[PDB]
């Protein structure tokens, strides 16, 4: 048996919205410490790692450990049927054939009950070693979402240049080319940079724009870079965990 309960269900709605366009199926590792999810996208260029700790649910129970094959779009379709204030409960029983999603409305006249089938999924996992990074940028997730959307008008790839007191995003195409420069500010809306070594890298804007689908999860986003290692884009589902996206550089 497995049962997890979350009084602010919108968290779970937004997590799904942030996943379903990048990856269609994935495996949910349930333990008594919380939920891990990890997967590559089909192209194997990006990866997504999701953490949701036990103590962030108001009721977590994981009697036996579980690995649950899930179509993330199916789960998304179901979660659309939740209100942002529904208390959302996930439950799986003995055999783990179906996953049950229970939505309790604060209006109190409504309890919705959905059950999706758990497919059987093959496991190509990867090991992401813990590192520290040459340059690390924390900035408003909305600013970042816009940088990515805008430069997509200009080119298909962005060059991120991080220095001692400011980061520069560059792209070029047929119209011409564009460059955006952010500096460090005088909290959530500050722009801060921790740099041990300057980095200048190149990434597909297509993928970043899938990443920014995680924007409604966090006011702030952090980017971590080193030369010859994947970029990490991290949104924090505060008090419970995070959504990290990993992306392979170009050339």
């Amino acid at each position: 048996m497995f049962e997890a309960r979350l009084v602010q269900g919108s968290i779970l709605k937004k997590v799904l919205e942030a996943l379903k366009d990048l990856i269609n199926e994935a495996c949910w590792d349930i333990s008594s410490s919380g939920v891990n999810l990890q997967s590559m996208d089909s192209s194997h260029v990006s990866l997504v790692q999701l953490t949701l700790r036990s103590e962030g649910f108001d009721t977590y129970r994981c009697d036996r450990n579980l690995a649950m094959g899930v179509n993330l779009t199916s789960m998304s379709k179901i979660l659309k049927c939740a209100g942002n204030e529904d208390i959302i409960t996930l439950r799986a029983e003995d055999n783990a054939d179906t996953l049950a999603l229970v939505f309790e409305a604060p209006n109190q006249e409504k309890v919705s009950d959905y059950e999706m089938k758990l497919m059987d999924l093959d496991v190509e996992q990867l090991g992401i070693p813990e590192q520290e990074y040459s340059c690390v940028v924390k900035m408003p997730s909305g600013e970042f979402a816009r940088i990515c959307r805008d430069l997509s008008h200009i080119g298909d790839a962005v060059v991120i240049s991080c220095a001692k007191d400011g980061v520069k995003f560059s792209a070029s195409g047929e119209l011409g080319n564009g460059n955006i420069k952010l500096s460090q500010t005088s909290e959530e809306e500050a722009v801060t940079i921790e740099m041990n070594e300057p980095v200048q890298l190149t990434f597909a804007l297509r993928y970043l724009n899938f990443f920014t689908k995680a924007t409604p999860l966090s006011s702030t986003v952090t980017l971590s870079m080193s030369a010859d290692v994947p970029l990490v884009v991290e949104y924090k589902i505060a008090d419970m965990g995070h959504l990290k996206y990993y992306l392979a550089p170009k050339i």
Partner: peptide
């Protein structure tokens, strides 16, 4: 430019 895969950076852990 060329697009690299994460295989080139992270090991296949099973």
């Amino acid at each position: 430019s060329h697009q690299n895969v994460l295989s080139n950076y992270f090991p296949r852990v099973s």
